[PDB]
Structure formats: structure tokens, C-alpha cells
Amino acid sequence: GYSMFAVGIGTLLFGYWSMMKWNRERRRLQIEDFEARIALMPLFQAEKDRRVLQMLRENLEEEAIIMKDVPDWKVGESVFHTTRWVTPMMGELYGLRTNEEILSATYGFIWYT
Amino acid sequence: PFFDVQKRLGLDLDRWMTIQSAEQPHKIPGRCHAFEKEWIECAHGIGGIRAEKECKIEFDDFVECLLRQKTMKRLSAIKRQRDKLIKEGKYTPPPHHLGKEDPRP
Amino acid sequence: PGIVELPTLEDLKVQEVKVSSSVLKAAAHHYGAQCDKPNKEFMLCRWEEKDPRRCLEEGKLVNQCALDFFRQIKRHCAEPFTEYWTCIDYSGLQLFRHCRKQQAKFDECVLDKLGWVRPDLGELSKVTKVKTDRPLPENPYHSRARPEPNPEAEGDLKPAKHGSRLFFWTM
Amino acid sequence: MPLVYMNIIMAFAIALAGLLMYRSHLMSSLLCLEGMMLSLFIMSTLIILNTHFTLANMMPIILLVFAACEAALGLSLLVMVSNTYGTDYVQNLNLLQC
Amino acid sequence: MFMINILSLIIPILLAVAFLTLVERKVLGYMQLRKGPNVVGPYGLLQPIADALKLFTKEPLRPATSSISMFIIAPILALSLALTMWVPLPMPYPLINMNLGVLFMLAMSSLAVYSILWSGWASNSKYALIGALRAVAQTISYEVTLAIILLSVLLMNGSYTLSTLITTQEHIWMIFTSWPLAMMWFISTLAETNRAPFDLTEGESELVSGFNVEYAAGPFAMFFMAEYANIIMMNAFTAILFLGASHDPHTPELYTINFVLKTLALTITFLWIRASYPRFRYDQLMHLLWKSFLPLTLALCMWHISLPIMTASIPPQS
Amino acid sequence: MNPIIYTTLIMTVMSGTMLVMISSHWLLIWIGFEMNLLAMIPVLMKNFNPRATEAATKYFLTQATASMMLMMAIIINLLYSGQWTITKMFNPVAMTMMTMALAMKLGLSPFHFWVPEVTQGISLQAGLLLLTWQKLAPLSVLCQISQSINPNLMLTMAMLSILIGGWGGLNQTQLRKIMAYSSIAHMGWMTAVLPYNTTMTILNLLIYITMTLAMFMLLIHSSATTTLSLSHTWNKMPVITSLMMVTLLSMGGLPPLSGFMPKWMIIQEMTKNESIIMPTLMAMTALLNLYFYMRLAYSSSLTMFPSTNNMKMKWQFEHTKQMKLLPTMIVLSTLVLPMTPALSSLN
Amino acid sequence: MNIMLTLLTNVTLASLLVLIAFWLPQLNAYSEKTSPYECGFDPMGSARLPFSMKFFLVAITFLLFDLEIALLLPLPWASQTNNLKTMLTMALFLLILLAASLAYEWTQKGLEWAE
Amino acid sequence: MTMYIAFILSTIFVIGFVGFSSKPSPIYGGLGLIVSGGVGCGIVLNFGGSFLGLMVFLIYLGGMLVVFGYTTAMATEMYPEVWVSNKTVFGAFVSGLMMEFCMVYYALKEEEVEIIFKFNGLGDWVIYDTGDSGFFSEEAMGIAALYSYGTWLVIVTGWSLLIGVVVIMEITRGN
Amino acid sequence: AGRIASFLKNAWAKEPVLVASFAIGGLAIILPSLSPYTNYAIRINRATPYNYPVPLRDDGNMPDVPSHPQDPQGPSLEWLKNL
Ligand SMILES: CCCCCCCCCCCCCCCCC[C@@H](O)O[C@H](CO[C@H](O)CCCCCCCCCCCCCCC)COP(=O)(O)OCC[N+](C)(C)C
Ligand SMILES: CCCCCCCCCCCCCCCCC[C@@H](O)O[C@H](CO[C@H](O)CCCCCCCCCCCCCCC)COP(=O)(O)OCC[N+](C)(C)C
Numbered sequence A: 001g002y003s004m005f006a007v008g009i010g011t012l013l014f015g016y017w018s019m020m021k022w023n024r025e026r027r028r029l030q031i032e033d034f035e036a037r038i039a040l041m042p043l044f045q046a047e048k049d050r051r052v053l054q055m056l057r058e059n060l061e062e063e064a065i066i067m068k069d070v071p072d073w074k075v076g077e078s079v080f081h082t083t084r085w086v087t088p089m090m091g092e093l094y095g096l097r098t099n100e101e102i103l104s105a106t107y108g109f110i111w112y113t
Numbered sequence B: 001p002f003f004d005v006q007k008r009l010g011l012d013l014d015r016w017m018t019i020q021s022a023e024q025p026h027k028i029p030g031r032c033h034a035f036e037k038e039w040i041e042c043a044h045g046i047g048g049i050r051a052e053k054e055c056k057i058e059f060d061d062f063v064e065c066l067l068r069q070k071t072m073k074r075l076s077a078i079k080r081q082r083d084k085l086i087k088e089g090k091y092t093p094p095p096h097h098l099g100k101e102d103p104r105p
Numbered sequence C: 001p002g003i004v005e006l007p008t009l010e011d012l013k014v015q016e017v018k019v020s021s022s023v024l025k026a027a028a029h030h031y032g033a034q035c036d037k038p039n040k041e042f043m044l045c046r047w048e049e050k051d052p053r054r055c056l057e058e059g060k061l062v063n064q065c066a067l068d069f070f071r072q073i074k075r076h077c078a079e080p081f082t083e084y085w086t087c088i089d090y091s092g093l094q095l096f097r098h099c100r101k102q103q104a105k106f107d108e109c110v111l112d113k114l115g116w117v118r119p120d121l122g123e124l125s126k127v128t129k130v131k132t133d134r135p136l137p138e139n140p141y142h143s144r145a146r147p148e149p150n151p152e153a154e155g156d157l158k159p160a161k162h163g164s165r166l167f168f169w170t171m
Numbered sequence D: 001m002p003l004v005y006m007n008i009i010m011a012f013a014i015a016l017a018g019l020l021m022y023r024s025h026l027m028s029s030l031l032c033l034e035g036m037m038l039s040l041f042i043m044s045t046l047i048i049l050n051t052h053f054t055l056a057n058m059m060p061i062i063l064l065v066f067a068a069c070e071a072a073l074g075l076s077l078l079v080m081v082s083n084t085y086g087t088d089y090v091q092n093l094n095l096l097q098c
Numbered sequence E: 001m002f003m004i005n006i007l008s009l010i011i012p013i014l015l016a017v018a019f020l021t022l023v024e025r026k027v028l029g030y031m032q033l034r035k036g037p038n039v040v041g042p043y044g045l046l047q048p049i050a051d052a053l054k055l056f057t058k059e060p061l062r063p064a065t066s067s068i069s070m071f072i073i074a075p076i077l078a079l080s081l082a083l084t085m086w087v088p089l090p091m092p093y094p095l096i097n098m099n100l101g102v103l104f105m106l107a108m109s110s111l112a113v114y115s116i117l118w119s120g121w122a123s124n125s126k127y128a129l130i131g132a133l134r135a136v137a138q139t140i141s142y143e144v145t146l147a148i149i150l151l152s153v154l155l156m157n158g159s160y161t162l163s164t165l166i167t168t169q170e171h172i173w174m175i176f177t178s179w180p181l182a183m184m185w186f187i188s189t190l191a192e193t194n195r196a197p198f199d200l201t202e203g204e205s206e207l208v209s210g211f212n213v214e215y216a217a218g219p220f221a222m223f224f225m226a227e228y229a230n231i232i233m234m235n236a237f238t239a240i241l242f243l244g245a246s247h248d249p250h251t252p253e254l255y256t257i258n259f260v261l262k263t264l265a266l267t268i269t270f271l272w273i274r275a276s277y278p279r280f281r282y283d284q285l286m287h288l289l290w291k292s293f294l295p296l297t298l299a300l301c302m303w304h305i306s307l308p309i310m311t312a313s314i315p316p317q318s
Numbered sequence F: 001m002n003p004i005i006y007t008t009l010i011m012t013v014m015s016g017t018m019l020v021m022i023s024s025h026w027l028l029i030w031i032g033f034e035m036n037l038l039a040m041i042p043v044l045m046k047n048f049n050p051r052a053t054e055a056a057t058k059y060f061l062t063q064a065t066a067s068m069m070l071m072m073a074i075i076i077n078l079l080y081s082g083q084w085t086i087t088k089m090f091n092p093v094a095m096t097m098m099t100m101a102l103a104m105k106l107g108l109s110p111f112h113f114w115v116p117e118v119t120q121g122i123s124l125q126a127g128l129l130l131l132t133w134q135k136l137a138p139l140s141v142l143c144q145i146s147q148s149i150n151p152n153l154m155l156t157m158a159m160l161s162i163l164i165g166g167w168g169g170l171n172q173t174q175l176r177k178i179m180a181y182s183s184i185a186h187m188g189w190m191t192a193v194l195p196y197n198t199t200m201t202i203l204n205l206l207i208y209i210t211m212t213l214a215m216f217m218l219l220i221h222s223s224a225t226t227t228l229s230l231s232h233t234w235n236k237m238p239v240i241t242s243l244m245m246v247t248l249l250s251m252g253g254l255p256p257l258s259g260f261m262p263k264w265m266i267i268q269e270m271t272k273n274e275s276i277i278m279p280t281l282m283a284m285t286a287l288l289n290l291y292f293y294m295r296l297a298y299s300s301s302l303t304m305f306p307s308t309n310n311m312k313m314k315w316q317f318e319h320t321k322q323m324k325l326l327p328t329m330i331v332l333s334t335l336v337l338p339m340t341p342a343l344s345s346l347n
Numbered sequence G: 001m002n003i004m005l006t007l008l009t010n011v012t013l014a015s016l017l018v019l020i021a022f023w024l025p026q027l028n029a030y031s032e033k034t035s036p037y038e039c040g041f042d043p044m045g046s047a048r049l050p051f052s053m054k055f056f057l058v059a060i061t062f063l064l065f066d067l068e069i070a071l072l073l074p075l076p077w078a079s080q081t082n083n084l085k086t087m088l089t090m091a092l093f094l095l096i097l098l099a100a101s102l103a104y105e106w107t108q109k110g111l112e113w114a115e
Numbered sequence H: 001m002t003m004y005i006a007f008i009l010s011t012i013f014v015i016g017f018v019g020f021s022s023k024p025s026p027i028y029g030g031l032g033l034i035v036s037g038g039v040g041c042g043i044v045l046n047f048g049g050s051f052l053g054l055m056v057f058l059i060y061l062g063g064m065l066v067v068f069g070y071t072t073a074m075a076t077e078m079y080p081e082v083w084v085s086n087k088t089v090f091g092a093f094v095s096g097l098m099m100e101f102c103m104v105y106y107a108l109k110e111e112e113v114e115i116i117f118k119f120n121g122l123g124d125w126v127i128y129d130t131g132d133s134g135f136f137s138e139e140a141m142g143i144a145a146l147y148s149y150g151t152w153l154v155i156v157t158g159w160s161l162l163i164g165v166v167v168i169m170e171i172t173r174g175n
Numbered sequence I: 001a002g003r004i005a006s007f008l009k010n011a012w013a014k015e016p017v018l019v020a021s022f023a024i025g026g027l028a029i030i031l032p033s034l035s036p037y038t039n040y041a042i043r044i045n046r047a048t049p050y051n052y053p054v055p056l057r058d059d060g061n062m063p064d065v066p067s068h069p070q071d072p073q074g075p076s077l078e079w080l081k082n083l
């Protein structure tokens, strides 16, 4: 009776100590790769800004070509009263593009398994 | 009717969850954080009756961000005109809207 | 509502950094150590202007500094870095802990040839200060003028004239 | 609004009509009530995900919780009704008039 | 190339089930001082094939009083769910990589009970009804305790991703930190797979055949394929949870072999238990799960919430 | 039921109401309603019998449907504006659904059908709770969203409630159904003035609660649930029947009694908004409530009905349990008209 | 997309197994053969008659306890919050009331099956 | 537009709702609600809410098991009804299917305000946000915030669950 | 004093499972308030950089703010490595 309980608690304490050490190491490693991501973030931000702006400009040029016959249509007219930057809705970015890359931009991360 | 215990005691039982622009975990922003912030700062302290008239611009922008109805109508109009032009063959879509672009990082 | 102003395709052009994500992850610590100043300037512009159109030149400087960093690495010792990022690239989760020997060789090379010290744990996540000549934006939200409030309550409180003035009550 | 929002709202309307239009079994009405709760869960979750309102990601769960309470409550009542009549027919609940 | 992976998963599982029938028969035989199947093929290696061929060439009967739609749907649901349970399991790489693989397993397991429920009800026979209601009682007995045990165990993993469990147990088996929980978890799996001493929905000596008494030939065989596949799957899940095999990214076959050996050991332990003990009464199972397992499980959930905070050992990946 | 469990359930009902009335978040108001209903169901079944079970089932079905509609309205309002605060509904469809849900919870016509039956199926103490405390939460919610309510729908429901309360009460011999129809008519009076002045709504609520508490306590004191049972009370406790007759006259709104003060304050308020036809119809319809109150007073106190021999034995025993607040309740139900201006303290 | 394909494959395999079972063998179906089984004899009543449940209270209690599972599964993510003292208090508080509700039902004979 | 998978899932959601709202035997109504719960889980998963969809599916599986047991105990009759064994049930089912078809047609071929507002189509993919950042799931963070931000919610929910246990104990007492 | 000892002996003899459950739950409740490593857990949680550290504009009055990650100023995770 006593011996069985003593062995059980001893095993539990050994496991607790081992897992404490391993989990502290895991937290340190996670901090490290989070720092790697933080170091890489500004470059990704710059490229994302340029990519979004180029897609919007290409859509603007194509819309200028397409809507030259409609009489009372302003090219690149906002739908907001405010003049500050509004983050583009992904429908605007991929509105005039093919179905496969729209499926990509919409469901690629969710469907990736 | 409304016994306003929270403000009397400074308790904050549920006010942390009422608006989209209020202290999210890990500073994750709402999709319409700027619009709601502008509308709330416009309408603060002037009363509901005055806010319904004098902050209509901010509220309309906030609603447009929420539902994107005007954006969808504009995209539909552009797509319809493009389809009409392509069916008759007057307009030809460029390579970079057909999958033949030069991608960038 | 007005026309949205967009940059031309010409001024959106830049010399891209065309290395894969494993190479970037392998170089990331020294990259954040060396190219800190332009990256921080760009990110300060980014969170202050709240507009990608207003921080294009700083993004170009970010690209240029990254290209110079990678060119310097390629010039001094490319083989240790190549083995390191190949080992990194094999992992499906791209783990640092599985490639410590190659990382040690790369670190020793960049320390001996370039005097590059790998940042310690906790350093790349510090909030730092940036000195800039860019003026602080005045109305980044493009806010309208706030409506005037209701004026105020002022004066001394007098008893109600002839009481409540309900139908027949004299008080 | 997208077709999905109107589909969820239609599901709620159908469940409410099912609850309001009774047949013999009380269990069928309880199922309609649970269906209304399910449609509310789906609709609120879709709105909260679409607008990225992080702190209301917890409210549908709480919603579910009180749904359970209702369900439990209803089932309890059904038991008593059955113990009185041997059926769960809503026709038997006619001792009380207007 | 993904369909090739689907096939390379599902077909070997079916062969493993077929030969697990033989393995259980021979293990029970040798524990009962006899031999078991050794005539049909060398050492009975051809017995599963003969059984399958006999079952699929025998006439299936549609009972006159039965509801045919659910009567046919239930075996399909059982077998398809049993096959689906395997796709998030990392061996060491999963076919489907999910953030919440544990929750997916829980939900699919909760859905698999309706196969027994609907087969028993749509049989429109009294013994099948008794088996279905016993399935209702069994789920009510085990579900809450199993979920809370799984949560308490995964508090040290840091997430619900199954592959992360490999990283969590790189230096020690998790059973050395939570052997009480594992104990109950093991018993819970016995109740979840309808295995002796908790084979109540079947109960050969009580209700002839229970929920599937009216089934014959192919659908009957489908029900047993589903049950044995579930046995192997649950034992593999237990091996992943509590017996963490070291994984080398350049030689994953070592992990695969070690994992298969551990799963085989757990399955043989199930067969051993079936050979050893009498059957529970189905109210006694409820009382065991609600008066002994549940209080200890709640206390251990409290303890496993407090322990990482007390010792500063919270895992990563919020 | 165990007394400790009963106290816990009563305090849970009260806590649900308080949660409704102190919350600024729609979800917490909904939770308060759910908690109130969950704790309220067992109180209706405290005295177990088939009638109590049927009443509890009808009540739960009605309130659960209303709660579903209320949550749907909240979600629609959130969809058209990312708002959780209870200020003013931004979508008219959501506002209509919310108004219908709150009317169903209150029992306003045409969602009044459940009010008599449930009141008949439960005990007098449960009826007291159901007809007094259960009105606070929906009325508080309605007061908070008063500016958003469409006047036509609310006024239609209020006029229907007054008419149906009078007509239904005209046909009743059971006292609990009489109280239920009285409650429906008074709820119509309360909700008629809500779009114009919530202080008048609060004043009417307080006065009605006082008179309803007085009547239920007087009915519990003289343990009568039918007209003929109440007709015996003069031969055992004449003071009780006299007080009941005066309180009944007050409930009918006759001056100089207190029950006149709410209607007088409401009609007057409506005339400040160029509303004359509706107040005129409202008073002329409240005449029906007065009629069946007068009939009850005729049968109870103004004449003497035949009694039974065994009543002699009841002459030898006093009432074991005394109601502390019954005298204050009667006095407040009758003699407070001269203190009418004090209603300014309610805004 | 891959999970949908997996589900379709599994369901199709099971359905084809059923088709093979019902179309390959020789069928000789008659009324005596298809009649309900009750070990030698015709059933006295219907199998659709009400079957009394003696654990009905435990079944209702399971519904409330199953939603306690919904409130506790976000715990691994909750341990990553900065204010651990608050979450630990609320996590422990939620498990205490679950233990108290089980204790209340246990002491009031709620876990005993109907006789 | 994009394979309309979500539109198909929502249509099946409505179909299962019609299945259980036409009110056949509660066995089939429970099955219909299970189908609706599964497809609703799928709908929520297609919008990024994995945890919410999986949990609602699990909860409704448990609830429908309890409902199946209670149906066998107290909601059975000699001949349980299916959607084609009764003129009323079949009529309700067909009416629901046809009015769903009418709404879908009138919404996708032209743009009309049915009850609240209008719709043109364009698929769900338009209303997405294209945000690019994070080593975590926003849904998981928001749900886990219940233990740090939602103390009041935890208190009221736990009290309600304890009271619900007491309440079901009281209601089924009898006497 | 002796009454509780007899009650515990009886409970250990008849219902050891409940005794173990109550003991474990009580330890789980009380031990965290007496542990010195709870604060270490809070500090470790606050040291995890989930989002980007946005730089502050230099105003010439920030002596405790680093100008570079490797500058000595700012928080230090030295305590974490030795743990
Ligand atoms: C592991 C899972 C995947 C396996 C992969 C294969 C999947 C096979 C699919 C399952 C079906 C196979 C069952 C094997 C036997 C075939 C059953 C049926 O199809 O055959 C007969 C089909 O015959 C039809 O009844 C009539 C024949 C023609 C009907 C018209 C259909 C169109 C054909 C036109 C012919 C023109 C040329 C066609 C070829 C180019 C049915 O006869 P029936 O007696 O009832 O039923 C008892 C069957 N018995 C006799 C074997 C016991
Ligand atoms: C005035 C009358 C007092 C007695 C009667 C009270 C009746 C109501 C019951 C209890 C009222 C609770 C009100 C307090 C609301 C909690 C929120 C506030 O106090 O702060 C929380 C303090 O939480 C503490 O843990 C206190 C909660 C402990 C209460 C649990 C048990 C007591 C409840 C008992 C009654 C409930 C019903 C019966 C249950 C058995 C969290 O603060 P913190 O996280 O730092 O910072 C939040 C901001 N962040 C997130 C941005 C960082």
C-alpha cells in the first residue's frame, strides 16, 4: 500500500521536473523564432504595400479603359466620404482576375492541410 | 429602468465588449477600427438627437466599411461592363488578369 | 466622394529580394542586427502615416539595405550560409534547433570576417527609438472638425417659481 | 448582403415557423427551438468572424450554454407532461382556458 | 498524388482489421488453452479472407418491419467514420494536418454513436432497441469524463495539434507525468469502443446480438470492420498521447516502426482484458464513470491547470 | 420544495431582473432574461399538480419563443451596426422584432393568450410574483429604447391590450383570471404613454404594482380563488372585504383614489402631443375593467351572500401568519392622490 | 479541399461495399425469413412502443455538463495570458461550481436510476 | 463565383432546417438537425472559425443523443412518420423547399429587397479582409479572452449552470 | 481534534477516491498562492513577442529607450536563460 503510492508520487515528481525543464526550453526557442519573424517583418510589409498598390493601379487602368463609354462614371472614384487610406477589400484586389487565384487568395490558408 | 451601477462604482462589468475599438487581446484591430473611432469621437457628448444628424457622414462611412454595399455595386457595374465589352470583342483583357503576370514578392 | 490617388507603376518598381523564406529565416538575426535603422524608420513611417502611399521611399531603402546585407554575405562566405539554410529548408516547420552546427559555423564566419555578433535572446523584440527628419503628421485620420458641444449648465439654483405649478397644487 | 446571410436568416424563419405551427408532439417543437438556437449561433459567428471583432468570439459559446439550459428545462417539463398522460401531445395541455 | 495517399491509408487499415480478427481469435485461444484458427491457411493466415468472402457472398436480408433508409445508412456511416478517424493521426506526418485534431477526433467519435443508434432503431426489433438504448447510456456515462481527461492531458502540450505531441514527449513519455489520467483514459477508451468489460450494446449473452441482431452478410461485416478499425485507431491515439516515440526528420521510418509496435501492444492489451474479466452491468458503468472517474478527473483537471503556473512550465504556441 | 432552495430560486429570479436593469450590453440583458426564466419555472410548479405543470409548460414555451426573437433582433442590429450597447436600434426590422419579443414577454395583445391560463394554473403567491415582478425587466428595456419604437405598432398593441383586458375580464368568475385580464389592460395603459414619457410609464407601473400587491395579499389572507369562495369572507372577516372593496374601487380609477392618478397623468401627457382620440377611447374602454371590479365588489362586500354552517368553527381561530406590508400597501393603493406632484422625483 | 475529398472517398467506398453486398449474392427472400427475431416466437407487442428510461435525470444533467466542456477547452490558450492570477481564479471557480453541482445531484439521489 | 461551396453548404443547412421543421417523427427531426449542425460547422470553418464550428457540432451531437433517448422513451407511436407518410408533413417539406428555391432564384437572377435589404450575389469571397500577419489564431485568442476579460460572463454562466442543475432537480421531483 | 481524525479514517476506509479528489483539488487551489514561480510564469508570458515592437519617435528626452536592439538599455531576458 505505502510502497505503491510512494513509487507513484516519485514517478509523478520526476515527470514534473523533466517537463518543467523541457517546457522552459520550448518557451525560449519560441521567443527566438518569434524574434526572427520580428526581424523579417519590415521587408514583408514593404513588399506587401507595393504589391497591393500595383494591383490597385492595374485595376484602375483596366477600369479606365473599360468604362470610357459609360457617360457619368468617375474613374477611381471612392465610395467613402473620408480621404484617408482604407485597406482594400480583397474583392477589389481580385475583382478582374481568374477564378483559380481568387480561390487561392480566399481559401488557400483554410484549405491547406 | 437602467440603474447605471457600473459608472457609479467604476466597475466595468460589460463595457469592455460593447465596441469594436476597445482594447482587444494582443492589440488585434477590428476590420473597421478607424471608422468606428471617428464616428464615436464625432458623436461623443452631443446627444443622440444631434449625433443622428451631425455625424451622419462618419456613420455612413462606418456602415460602408461594415457591409461594403457600395463597393459591391461598383464592382458589379465594372464586371458587367467588362462582360458586355468582351462578348462583342471590343475589349480584350490583358495578360496579367488572365494568369500570365510576372509575380513579385 | 473624390478620386483615390494611386502611384504609377514606375515608382512602385524596386530591386526585389528574390531569396526564399528559409534563406531569410537563416539570415534573420544578423539581418535585424545590421539593417535596423532603415527598417525602424520605415516602420515608424508606417505606423505614423497609416498610409502605404506615404512610405514608399523608406520601403525602397529597406530593400536596398537588405540587398547590401545579402551581397556582403555572398561576398565573404557563401558556403557556410548555404549549408545552414539548406538544413533550415529541410524542416517542414523550419526549426532553428535542428541546425545548430551549421549555425555555429555561419556565426563564426560572420564574426571573424565581418565582426557580426548574433543578437541575444530578448534583444530583437525591444521597443527602440528612431530619429527622423520626417515631420509628425497632423491629422493622419483625416478627421473632420468635431461638432461643438452643448454649451453648459451654469448659475445658482433657485426654488421653482410658484412651486410645481401642477393643476391645482400651490406647492 | 451575401446569399449565405439570407440563407441563415431563412433557416431561422423556417425554424420559428416550425415552432409556431404545432403538430401533436412537443418534442418536435423542442427540436424547432434548438434549431433556432443553432441558426442564431451560425449567424452571430459569421458576423463576428467577418468584422474581426475579437472579443465577441466568446459570445456564441455563451449563447450555446444558455441554449443547453433551455433544452434541459424543456426536456424536464416534457417528462412531467408524459408522466401525467403517457404521451407528449400538446392536446393534453387544455385544463386551462382563457 | 493525394488520392494515392488516401488509398495507401485506407487499404492497409482494412487489411490490419482483417488480420486483427485472426490475432484476437488466436490470442483468446491460447489464453484458453487451445490454438484457435490454424487450418485455413498456414497458421490460419487465410482465415480472414475466407470469412470476408463468405460474408460478402451470403444473402443480406431486409427485415419486413424495418425502416430501410436508416437500416442501410447506418453501416455506411459506421465504416466511413471509422476510416475518417485516421486522417489527422501523425505517423509521424499526418495525412491531414489540423490545428485542432483532437477536437476533430472528439466530434467524429461523438458522431459515430449514431450508427449504432440508427441501426438499432431502424431494425424495428426489441433486442436491437435495447442495444441502442444501452449505447445512449454508455455515451452519457463516458463522454464528459473522456473530454475532461483529454483537456487535462493536453494542458501540457500547449495546443490541440496532434503532431505537437511528438515534440512535447521528446525526452520523457507523458505517461510519467499523468499516469492517473492515462489509467482512466484507458478505461474510457474501453467504454468508447464498446469493448469488454463494457461490450454492453452487443451483449451476446444478454441480448443475442444487441443492436445488430437483424444484420447479416455485408452490412454485418461492415459493422465489425468499423469496430475493429476503431479499436486500432483508439489504441494508436493513446500511444501518441502517452507513449511518445522519438522522431528523426531524416529517418521517419524509425518513428513509424516504434509507433506501430506501441499500438500493437495496446491492442493486444485490449484482447487480454477481454480474455480476463466478466462484463459490467450498464448502470454500474454509469456509476463507475460518474461517482469515481468524474470527481478524480475534476480534481486532476484543477491540478493540471495549476501545475504549469506554479512551476513556471507553461508550454508555447498560444 | 426546500426553503433554502426556494430562497435561492427567488434570489436568482431577482438577480436576473437586476442584471437586465443594470446592463449596458445586449448579451447581458439577454442572459438576465434567460436566468430569470430558468429560475422562474420551478417557482410556478412549487405546488405540484397537473395544472401547475401545464401552466409552467405554456409559460416556458412563450418566454423561450420571445427570447429567440429577442436574440434575433440583437443579432440583426449588430449586423447593420457593430454595436452591442442598448441605446437605440439602428435597423427598423430589428426594432420591430425586438418590440414584438418584448410585447410577447409582457403579455400585450395579441400575445396575451398565455397570461390568464398561467395565472389560473399557479398558486396565488406565484401569481403575485408573475404579475408584479416579471414586468420590470421588459418595461425597463422598452424604456431604454423608447425613442426607437415605432409609435403605430406600440399604440395598436396598447389599445388592443386595453380592449381585450376589459372584454375578457367581463366573462370571469375565477379571481386569478380577473387579475390577469386586469394586468393586460394595465400593461396596455403603461405601453401607450411610453413613446411620449417614460416617467409616466414608471409611475403607472409603481401604482399598479402597489394595488396588485394589495389585492393578492388580501386574496391570500382570505384564501379565496373564486367569486363564491370570496362571498363567504364577510361572515368571517368583514374588515377584509371592506378593504378589498375600496381597493377594487381604486383599481377602477375612480377619483379621489390613487388608481385615478396614473390615467389622469397619462391622458394629460398625451394631450401635450396632440393625441385626443386615443386617450378618449382608452378611458371609455377602462370603464369595462371598472364594471367587472364593481361586480366583484357587489358579490363580496356591498351585499351579503349565504354562508355555511361549518363557518362557525372558523369563527374560533385567528390568522396564523401576518402580512407586515399589507396595511402600507392598502394605504398606498388608496390615499396618495394629494401627493401627485412627487412624481417629479421619478425623472 | 483535401478533407472533402477524403470524406467523399470513404463514403463512396462504404456505399460500393453495400452495393456489392446487395447485388452479388443470390437472394431468396420470403415473409418467414424477413420476420422480426425474438429467439423463437412472434413478438407480443410492437418494438415502437414506449421504452421507459430510468436514467432520464442523468441524461438531462449530461446536457448541462456537456456545455461545461465547451467552457473549458479554451484553457490551453487562456494559460498564455499575462494576468494569470485572474484566469486561474476563474478557471478554478468554474470547475468548483461543476463539482458542487455534481455534489448537489449526488446527495439529492439524482444519480440513482428510477426504480 | 468561387465554386459556390459555401452557397451549397448554406442551401443544405436550409434543407435540413426544413426537414426538421416540417416535424416528422423526432428520430428524423433529430437526424435533420444533426445534418444541419454538420453543414453549419462546415460553413463556419470556411470562414476561419474552426473551434466554433467543431464545438457547436460536438454540442449538438450530444444534445441529439439525449433527444433520441427521450424520443424512444416518450415521443414514439405505433407508426413513426417520415416525410412521405403524411400529407401535412410532405406538404410542409415541399413548401419549404419551393420557397427556398424561390428566394434563391429571386436573389441571384435579379437584385431585390426580400424582407430587410437586397442582395446581388458575387459569392462570399468578396467580403473577406486579406489581412496578413500572426503566429496565432484570432478566434482562439478571442475565445481564450473569456478568462481574462470576461470575468463577469464566467460568473453569470457558472451560476446559471449550477442553478440549472438545481432547477431540473426540482422540476422532476413530482410529489 | 480527534473527531476530524476519526472522520478522515472512516472516509479513507470507505471512499478513498473522494478523499484523494478532495486532497488534490485543495492542493490545486492553495499551492499557487504560495509558489514563487507564479510570477516567473507571468514574466515568461509577458516576454513572448507576438506582435511587432513599434519604434518610438526620438524627441531627445528618452534616456531609457535603446537606439538599437543590442544597446544596453531596455528589458533583458538574462533571467530567462538561467532558468
Ligand atoms: C471494393 C469496392 C469497389 C469494387 C469495384 C467494382 C464495383 C462494382 C459495383 C457493384 C455491382 C457488382 C455486383 C456483381 C453482380 C452484378 C449485379 C447486376 O448488376 O447484374 C444484373 C444486372 O442485370 C439487370 O437486371 C438487367 C440487364 C440489363 C439492364 C439494362 C441496363 C443497360 C445495359 C444495356 C446493355 C448494352 C451493352 C452494355 C455494355 C457495353 C442484376 O441481375 P439480378 O438477377 O436482378 O440480381 C441478382 C444478381 N445475381 C444474379 C448475380 C445474383
Ligand atoms: C456591491 C455588493 C458586493 C457583494 C454582492 C456582489 C453580487 C455579485 C457577485 C460578485 C460580483 C462580481 C463583480 C466584479 C466583476 C469582475 C471584474 C473586475 O472585478 O475585475 C476582474 C477581477 O477578477 C477577480 O478575479 C475577481 C473575480 C473573483 C469572483 C469569483 C467568485 C465570487 C463570485 C460569488 C457570487 C457569484 C454567484 C455565486 C457563485 C458560487 C478582472 O480584472 P483584471 O483581469 O485584473 O483586469 C481586467 C482588464 N484587462 C483584462 C484589460 C487586463
Ligand SMILES: CCCCCCCC/C=C\CCCCCCCC(=O)O[C@H](COC(=O)CCCCCCC/C=C/CCCCCCCC)COP(=O)(O)OCCN
Pocket (backbone or CB within 6 Å): A008, A009, A012, E175, E180, E181, E182, E183, E184, E186, E187, E197, E238, E242, E273, E288, E292, E296, E303, I017, I020, I024
Ligand atoms: C503531488 C500531487 C500529485 C497528484 C495526485 C497523484 C496521485 C493520485 C493517486 C490516485 C490515482 C488513482 C487513479 C485511478 C483512477 C480509478 C480508481 C478507482 O477507484 O476506480 C475503481 C474501479 O476502476 C476499475 O477498476 C476499472 C474496472 C475495469 C478494468 C478494465 C481493465 C483493467 C485495467 C488494465 C490495465 C490498465 C492500464 C492503463 C494504462 C494504459 C497506458 C495508456 C473504483 O471502483 P470500485 O472499486 O468499484 O469502488 C468505487 C465504488 N465503491
Ligand SMILES: CCCCCCCC/C=C\CCCCCCCC(=O)O[C@H](COC(=O)CCCCCCC/C=C/CCCCCCCC)COP(=O)(O)OCCN
Pocket (backbone or CB within 6 Å): E294, E295, E296, E298, E299, G096, G099, G100, G102, G103, G106, G107, I008, I011, I015, I018, I019, I020, I021, I022, I023, I024, I025, I026, I027, I029
Ligand atoms: C478545497 C478544494 C475543493 C475542490 C476539489 C474537489 C474536486 C472534485 C471533487 C468533488 C467532486 C464531487 C464530490 C461528490 C460528493 C459525494 C457526496 C456523497 O454522497 O457522499 C457519500 C459517501 O459519503 C462520503 O462523502 C465519503 C466521506 C465524506 C466525503 C469524502 C471525504 C471529504 C474530504 C476528505 C479529504 C480531506 C483532505 C485530505 C486530508 C488528508 C490528511 C491531511 C456517497 O456515497 P453513497 O453513494 O451515497 O453510498 C451508497 C453506496 N454505499
